[PDB]
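User: Please run a holo structure prediction.
Assistant: Happy to. Please share the sequence and the ligand.
User: Here you go; the ligand is SM3.
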Amino acid sequence: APQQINDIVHRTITPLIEQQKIPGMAVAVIYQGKPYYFTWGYADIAKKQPVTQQTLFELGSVSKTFTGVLGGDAIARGEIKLSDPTTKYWPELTAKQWNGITLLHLATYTAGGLPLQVPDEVKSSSDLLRFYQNWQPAWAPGTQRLYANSSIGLFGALAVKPSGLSFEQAMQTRVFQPLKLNHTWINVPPAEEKNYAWGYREGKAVHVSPGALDAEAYGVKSTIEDMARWVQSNLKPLDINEKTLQQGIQLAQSRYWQTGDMYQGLGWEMLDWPVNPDSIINGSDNKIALAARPVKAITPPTPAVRASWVHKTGATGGFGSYVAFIPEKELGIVMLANKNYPNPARVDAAWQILNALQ
Ligand SMILES: O=C(Cc1cccs1)N[C@H](B(O)O)c1ccccc1
């Protein structure tokens, strides 16, 4: 890598790994469109397996960006419309609080207070119908944003219904394969287990547990190479050959709602560039990011703005990920770690690196 990239990445990440006691980490910097990779530490402490460019990490909520894009692709295919009521795709959702709640509200966490987590007790498909039927919104739809797995998770499940494909099959066929993300998975195959890093929570090696709508909200595992390709795809959607996927990417970066200086896309979150680093750094902290906040509708949504800082944080019990890019500068970064460490530390490091290179 050019020495400038080598230096800012190592001078920023090495201290981070030491301060946060991260076992293993992989970073990709996309500079002028080309990827540069960096790895440190361990994917499996006990077995002394190092992190490599082929190591799989749990992406946690960064998976929502894939769900948003898959949803965008379904819209582009004419299979669903964000203005469609949720009941159009789940007629069994007859409870009256659902009248007025559209796929847009589900995708953008504005349905009226759907909860952050789907309860552990929910497993069967009928357990899920019961959970949503019994949920009582705190607010009218389209008035407040409350980040929630049960919101975008349901959007993902419903978005693929017209296709008749399972969510995993749709994701593989319509997003992973076209983009050549050949080492990106919702369920890690046995052939790839040798590369699946363990996550570490309080020193214990752990992997994400099965849960309702897990694939849709936090279930993707990927390598640093495939994630750099994901960043390149989102930085330059026009280079993508598959028409509906190119449009879906563009739709996921449209600005649907505004809260403070942040705009909500489908999965992706965006701020105008140049950004005030404190605004995105402090903003990433969980109980700012997970708070109930009033939203202003952007009517109609603003098409993807090239001069934006587009990003998403993600975590599972044992992993912490972060992706951010700036279309206008053809610049981006992916940070994958097998410890769920504070979001502000991720954003601070990313900003230090990208600001140095911009
Ligand atoms: O819920 C998850 C995945 C899991 C975290 C712990 C067990 S599964 N992730 C989202 B996302 O990374 O934003 C989340 C939700 C609530 C709090 C922190 C993270």
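Residues 146 and 292 are 5 Å apart (CA to CA).
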